[PDB]
Symmetry: D2
Subunit: 259 residues, 4 copies
């Protein structure tokens, strides 16, 4: 359909949002290369999807590995059209007294430095092609505070600013750099049959502002499909939230005055 | 796609409104062209065919807006998409070029037209616990210098409306988002010379597919978002680079 | 005394935030023109404060009245340094079904069109002076939804876009255009407010405006300075559900 | 004398904006503890100003040193009222092809991780006192892109997010956390570019200007200001003058 004959690299594409983006991009004609370090999940997936889907282990904290993944993909299919820097690790809401200098630098390496390096080499191969699309995974905590840890928030804020400066610089060559800032999708925490899904799906019905629909990974996948489609040929520098209006309301006032 | 949905497009006789209308017809929904260019509007709504009706509606008349909505809800069964596109534009100007009579008139067309479309779309959508309201703002919401003072302030108010609307209509499962395009309203040579994302020209069909996305079940969880279509123009002040590297 | 020899016009300056800013500007040397439509309160204040404080009735929805207010201030003192478009009417959180087209247009006139006109005639006299300072009153609802009505929200959003596009235009002459977006116009305030231990009074919004209008802000322009104690930066629904 | 009887710590306080805030805080009563790694400048300054101003070497990349700097101040004075995370290194506009993983990580350490540790240990002593104030040095590139490099841009954006969630968390105890995002660039031909690039014409952005903005942000005058990224840009980040300039 929308991605017939396009080539995509999806870091973290073996689990959660990346896996759904990978399945979706496959469904729309794209030549996709799963990139992750969960090698069983990743390689099994790229073989389950099949002919147009490859896998490539890549630690985003090692530039040699990153440069290798892009150049391998360039050699297999001909070029890179979509670069989805999804790989990251999360941190729930916490205190600054729970920030460990070690855990902090590790979190930053995976989230932000992985984003820089993934972008740097995506740009390196895209500039000569004068065509392309780069999409970062930030989070809703970029527009509101209180749904993520301090280091995780700070890492995703930097991801947003990087995406911005990328749109300016990389615009000169006609390739776009956008974000997506989804919410808490039911893929990160451990699954256990139907009890966990229904209870967590009920709490999302509680906390979310837009009630009646629940955020799946496929939902974030189609947002990225649009953001990566040529239907967005003039969208760049945009941090498109998929939050149902959570980051635009502090209902403390209404709820206190309704008691 | 949009099969079996209902669309109301204020300003659907010219440009962006007409392109979104042709798109919604092009696959799926039943569209109700609403504008005051009745020749253009009726010509289009007849060229398109069965699923496309027309209805004169001056957005400054709450009774006319109420009538258009209620006629469509009675004709098809309900209203799924409300596209508050109708408006008048004004390029960059001075505060001294604002005429209070022009000011209030433009404010009437842009901001009050959105308000009334919002109120009566909400009136018919809330009981269905469904709906989609999509405002046409402008790129001047994130940067200033591409629109006049009355225009920017009118679109800033549209955003605050959309925000507070999404919070309120969230309780019922209804989404309220904006789209803030750039310049579709020689012309294309200057547009290239200014745009940040070079190579691609911003047409009305571009916003049409953007609005289709925002209204699609593919956006089941997008609400409170002012989705710019600017190619990164509103996120850069190229003065520093242009002065120190020219 | 940070306002020695300056001239300020404070629309809505007879009640609340305007009255607090006006007493403050008096406290720092400034010659102030209280502008409102509550003529009793305004002249009482302008007589109690003393020589450097005058009054001028001005319905901001009447351009002739505002143009008169500007020129009266220019003729009385020599010029205008500060134009504080504070006058406005409030509307608490409500529904879209409670928006009345006539009541809507009234709030817009006072809030947005009053601000437009106050700016236009402040600009008219400030451009030739090659200096100036303009401060609008928005509200914390500029950054969050759920603490104000739909019409008030949209009017204050429009005020912000006005202030922004104005700071761009009036920069060429050395003129600044800023906003202030406070929270409290209480035990309830203690409960809702994010920054605990203190409370937003009118004097706080007044001293924020004093800074914004001082030379302490010589290069501050285009800013919508929130005074919310971090209310507009947190949606605690998630954490509050999971803590019990 | 607004800061009468207050105690302030300024990391990077031996040079520039930190130095301007330090003398300003001295002028307004406050007891200041200069923290930097240019030990010559800092001690020269801290003895220049006099009895209420001391100096303390502190590499913010060393959690042990920052913990010592905070505890030294509490041991000297009793507590910490103001913490100004000013220390950082700059990067002008660049390309992503000029990004070195070793340099990037170093800049990230000094700018963002130093902020985390300085904030963490300021909080360590401020929470029990149920009072305090944390102020970061960001930059004008937080609201516009085109006056800083990608590594600086991302580091100051992250500095903003830290301040936001910190203000959310530390509000419960009566502590405020704000940022200031000056126009770091502009601080004969220097004057020609000042006339050219700046939006608000007619005024020059000095370090003392940013110093006085921080004085307000740290003063009682901001008793209810928290979570705010107060830009000092003269409206630079609110206009893309390309459109008007092309049509002229």
């Amino acid at each position: 359909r929308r991605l017939e004959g396009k080539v995509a690299i999806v870091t973290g594409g073996a689990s959660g949002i990346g896996a759904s983006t990978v399945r979706l991009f496959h469904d729309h004609g794209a030549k996709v290369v799963i990139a992750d370090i969960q090698d069983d999940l990743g390689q099994t997936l790229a073989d389950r999807l099949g002919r147009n889907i490859s896998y490539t282990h890549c630690d985003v904290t090692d530039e040699d590995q990153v440069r290798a993944l892009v150049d391998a993909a360039v050699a297999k299919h001909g070029g890179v059209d979509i670069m989805f820097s999804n790989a990251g690790i999360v941190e729930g809401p916490n205190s600054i007294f729970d920030v460990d200098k070690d855990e902090l630098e590790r979190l930053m390496g995976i989230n932000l430095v992985g984003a820089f390096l993934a972008a740097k080499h995506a740009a390196r191969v895209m500039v000569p092609a004068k065509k392309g699309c780069i999409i970062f995974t930030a989070s809703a905590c970029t527009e509101i505070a209180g749904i993520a840890g301090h280091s995780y928030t700070a890492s995703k804020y930097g991801i947003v600013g990087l995406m911005k400066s990328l749109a300016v610089e990389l615009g000169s060559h006609g390739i776009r750099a956008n974000c997506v800032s989804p919410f808490g999708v039911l893929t990160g925490i451990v699954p256990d049959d139907e009890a966990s899904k229904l209870m967590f799906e009920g709490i999302m019905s509680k906390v979310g502002n837009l009630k009646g629909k629940i955020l799946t990974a496929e939902d974030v996948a189609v947002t990225v499909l649009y953001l990566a489609s040529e239907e967005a040929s003039y969208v760049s520098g945009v941090n498109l939230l998929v939050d149902g209006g959570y980051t635009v309301v502090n209902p403390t006032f209404i709820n206190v005055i309704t008691a």
